[PDB]
Design a protein around this motif. Structure first.
Motif, PDB file in Angstrom:
ATOM      1  N   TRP A   1      26.074  42.326 -91.726  1.00  0.00           N
ATOM      2  CA  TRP A   1      27.382  42.950 -91.511  1.00  0.00           C
ATOM      3  C   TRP A   1      27.799  43.751 -92.722  1.00  0.00           C
ATOM      4  O   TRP A   1      27.765  43.247 -93.829  1.00  0.00           O
ATOM      5  CB  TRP A   1      28.452  41.895 -91.166  1.00  0.00           C
ATOM      6  N   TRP A   2      28.178  45.012 -92.514  1.00  0.00           N
ATOM      7  CA  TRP A   2      28.654  45.866 -93.586  1.00  0.00           C
ATOM      8  C   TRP A   2      30.109  46.153 -93.385  1.00  0.00           C
ATOM      9  O   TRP A   2      30.530  46.430 -92.270  1.00  0.00           O
ATOM     10  CB  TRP A   2      27.877  47.175 -93.583  1.00  0.00           C
ATOM     11  N   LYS A   3      30.892  46.075 -94.452  1.00  0.00           N
ATOM     12  CA  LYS A   3      32.302  46.405 -94.323  1.00  0.00           C
ATOM     13  C   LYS A   3      32.535  47.919 -94.421  1.00  0.00           C
ATOM     14  O   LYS A   3      32.145  48.565 -95.393  1.00  0.00           O
ATOM     15  CB  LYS A   3      33.147  45.639 -95.332  1.00  0.00           C
TER      16      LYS A   3
ATOM     17  N   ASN B   1      38.976  54.886 -89.657  1.00  0.00           N
ATOM     18  CA  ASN B   1      40.091  55.786 -89.879  1.00  0.00           C
ATOM     19  C   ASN B   1      41.381  54.960 -89.981  1.00  0.00           C
ATOM     20  O   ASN B   1      42.020  54.585 -88.964  1.00  0.00           O
ATOM     21  CB  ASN B   1      40.145  56.851 -88.783  1.00  0.00           C
ATOM     22  N   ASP B   2      41.734  54.651 -91.225  1.00  0.00           N
ATOM     23  CA  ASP B   2      42.893  53.825 -91.493  1.00  0.00           C
ATOM     24  C   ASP B   2      42.624  52.366 -91.088  1.00  0.00           C
ATOM     25  O   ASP B   2      43.491  51.516 -91.247  1.00  0.00           O
ATOM     26  CB  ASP B   2      44.174  54.391 -90.825  1.00  0.00           C
ATOM     27  N   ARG B   3      41.426  52.074 -90.582  1.00  0.00           N
ATOM     28  CA  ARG B   3      41.055  50.679 -90.298  1.00  0.00           C
ATOM     29  C   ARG B   3      39.849  50.231 -91.132  1.00  0.00           C
ATOM     30  O   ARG B   3      38.963  51.035 -91.418  1.00  0.00           O
ATOM     31  CB  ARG B   3      40.783  50.467 -88.803  1.00  0.00           C
ATOM     32  N   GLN B   4      39.836  48.950 -91.515  1.00  0.00           N
ATOM     33  CA  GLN B   4      38.715  48.334 -92.251  1.00  0.00           C
ATOM     34  C   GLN B   4      38.165  47.070 -91.602  1.00  0.00           C
ATOM     35  O   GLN B   4      38.913  46.280 -91.043  1.00  0.00           O
ATOM     36  CB  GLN B   4      39.134  47.985 -93.671  1.00  0.00           C
ATOM     37  N   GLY B   5      36.858  46.872 -91.688  1.00  0.00           N
ATOM     38  CA  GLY B   5      36.266  45.663 -91.164  1.00  0.00           C
ATOM     39  C   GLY B   5      34.774  45.790 -91.050  1.00  0.00           C
ATOM     40  O   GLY B   5      34.231  46.865 -91.310  1.00  0.00           O
ATOM     41  N   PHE B   6      34.104  44.731 -90.604  1.00  0.00           N
ATOM     42  CA  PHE B   6      32.646  44.716 -90.484  1.00  0.00           C
ATOM     43  C   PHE B   6      32.100  45.252 -89.168  1.00  0.00           C
ATOM     44  O   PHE B   6      32.716  45.123 -88.132  1.00  0.00           O
ATOM     45  CB  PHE B   6      32.073  43.329 -90.724  1.00  0.00           C
ATOM     46  N   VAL B   7      30.914  45.841 -89.241  1.00  0.00           N
ATOM     47  CA  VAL B   7      30.088  46.159 -88.086  1.00  0.00           C
ATOM     48  C   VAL B   7      28.681  45.619 -88.286  1.00  0.00           C
ATOM     49  O   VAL B   7      28.332  45.244 -89.380  1.00  0.00           O
ATOM     50  CB  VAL B   7      30.009  47.687 -87.851  1.00  0.00           C
ATOM     51  N   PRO B   8      27.878  45.590 -87.224  1.00  0.00           N
ATOM     52  CA  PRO B   8      26.466  45.288 -87.332  1.00  0.00           C
ATOM     53  C   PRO B   8      25.727  46.306 -88.179  1.00  0.00           C
ATOM     54  O   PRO B   8      25.514  47.444 -87.724  1.00  0.00           O
ATOM     55  CB  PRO B   8      25.987  45.411 -85.890  1.00  0.00           C
ATOM     56  N   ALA B   9      25.320  45.900 -89.389  1.00  0.00           N
ATOM     57  CA  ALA B   9      24.665  46.790 -90.382  1.00  0.00           C
ATOM     58  C   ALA B   9      23.697  47.804 -89.787  1.00  0.00           C
ATOM     59  O   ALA B   9      23.620  48.954 -90.237  1.00  0.00           O
ATOM     60  CB  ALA B   9      23.959  45.981 -91.463  1.00  0.00           C
ATOM     61  N   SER B  10      22.975  47.391 -88.767  1.00  0.00           N
ATOM     62  CA  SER B  10      21.921  48.223 -88.254  1.00  0.00           C
ATOM     63  C   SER B  10      22.428  49.184 -87.178  1.00  0.00           C
ATOM     64  O   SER B  10      21.640  49.947 -86.593  1.00  0.00           O
ATOM     65  CB  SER B  10      20.794  47.347 -87.725  1.00  0.00           C
ATOM     66  N   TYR B  11      23.731  49.152 -86.913  1.00  0.00           N
ATOM     67  CA  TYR B  11      24.338  50.104 -86.001  1.00  0.00           C
ATOM     68  C   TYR B  11      24.896  51.290 -86.771  1.00  0.00           C
ATOM     69  O   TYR B  11      25.533  52.149 -86.176  1.00  0.00           O
ATOM     70  CB  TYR B  11      25.476  49.462 -85.190  1.00  0.00           C
TER      71      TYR B  11
ATOM     72  N   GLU C   1      36.356  42.258 -87.856  1.00  0.00           N
ATOM     73  CA  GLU C   1      35.479  43.347 -87.438  1.00  0.00           C
ATOM     74  C   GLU C   1      36.319  44.565 -87.172  1.00  0.00           C
ATOM     75  O   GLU C   1      37.539  44.480 -87.099  1.00  0.00           O
ATOM     76  CB  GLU C   1      34.695  42.962 -86.174  1.00  0.00           C
ATOM     77  N   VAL C   2      35.663  45.709 -87.014  1.00  0.00           N
ATOM     78  CA  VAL C   2      36.369  46.948 -86.669  1.00  0.00           C
ATOM     79  C   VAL C   2      35.588  47.695 -85.588  1.00  0.00           C
ATOM     80  O   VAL C   2      34.372  47.544 -85.502  1.00  0.00           O
ATOM     81  CB  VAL C   2      36.617  47.838 -87.924  1.00  0.00           C
ATOM     82  N   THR C   3      36.306  48.487 -84.775  1.00  0.00           N
ATOM     83  CA  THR C   3      35.737  49.375 -83.732  1.00  0.00           C
ATOM     84  C   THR C   3      35.262  50.761 -84.247  1.00  0.00           C
ATOM     85  O   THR C   3      35.946  51.394 -85.041  1.00  0.00           O
ATOM     86  CB  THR C   3      36.794  49.645 -82.626  1.00  0.00           C
ATOM     87  N   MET C   4      34.119  51.230 -83.746  1.00  0.00           N
ATOM     88  CA  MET C   4      33.561  52.539 -84.076  1.00  0.00           C
ATOM     89  C   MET C   4      32.836  53.128 -82.852  1.00  0.00           C
ATOM     90  O   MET C   4      32.480  52.389 -81.941  1.00  0.00           O
ATOM     91  CB  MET C   4      32.601  52.419 -85.259  1.00  0.00           C
ATOM     92  N   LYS C   5      32.625  54.447 -82.842  1.00  0.00           N
ATOM     93  CA  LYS C   5      31.943  55.164 -81.744  1.00  0.00           C
ATOM     94  C   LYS C   5      30.700  55.792 -82.330  1.00  0.00           C
ATOM     95  O   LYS C   5      30.690  56.094 -83.516  1.00  0.00           O
ATOM     96  CB  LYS C   5      32.822  56.307 -81.158  1.00  0.00           C
ATOM     97  N   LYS C   6      29.672  56.015 -81.504  1.00  0.00           N
ATOM     98  CA  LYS C   6      28.516  56.815 -81.894  1.00  0.00           C
ATOM     99  C   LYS C   6      28.978  58.059 -82.646  1.00  0.00           C
ATOM    100  O   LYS C   6      30.039  58.614 -82.342  1.00  0.00           O
ATOM    101  CB  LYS C   6      27.734  57.246 -80.662  1.00  0.00           C
ATOM    102  N   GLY C   7      28.199  58.509 -83.621  1.00  0.00           N
ATOM    103  CA  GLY C   7      28.528  59.758 -84.327  1.00  0.00           C
ATOM    104  C   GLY C   7      29.636  59.697 -85.373  1.00  0.00           C
ATOM    105  O   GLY C   7      29.698  60.557 -86.244  1.00  0.00           O
ATOM    106  N   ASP C   8      30.528  58.713 -85.292  1.00  0.00           N
ATOM    107  CA  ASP C   8      31.549  58.516 -86.318  1.00  0.00           C
ATOM    108  C   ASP C   8      30.931  58.443 -87.707  1.00  0.00           C
ATOM    109  O   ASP C   8      29.803  57.983 -87.868  1.00  0.00           O
ATOM    110  CB  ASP C   8      32.293  57.215 -86.073  1.00  0.00           C
TER     111      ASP C   8
END
Length: 57
Positions: free
Chosen positions: A36-38, A42-52, A17-24
């Motif tokens: 889950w979408w990959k 920013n220089d990082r890759q991984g999945f988040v909850p698709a609906s986020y 998984e990867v970390t992200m913030k609102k608005g990114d």
């Protein structure tokens, strides 16, 4: 590619998984999973909850 917008923050809870913030703005790498979408943040890759995230496109 593509681009998505993060609608919420997300801390990674697992090694693929990867970390992200609102608005990114993220590059969508793979949306073949419903849950889950990959993404590239920013220089990082991984999945988040698709609906986020939202598509822009």
């Amino acid at each position: 590619k593509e681009l998505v917008l993060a609608l919420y923050d997300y801390q990674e809870k697992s090694p693929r998984e990867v970390t992200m913030k609102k608005g990114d703005i993220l590059t969508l790498l793979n949306s073949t999973n419903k849950d889950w979408w990959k993404v590239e943040v920013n220089d990082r890759q991984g999945f988040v909850p698709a609906s986020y995230v939202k598509k822009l496109d």
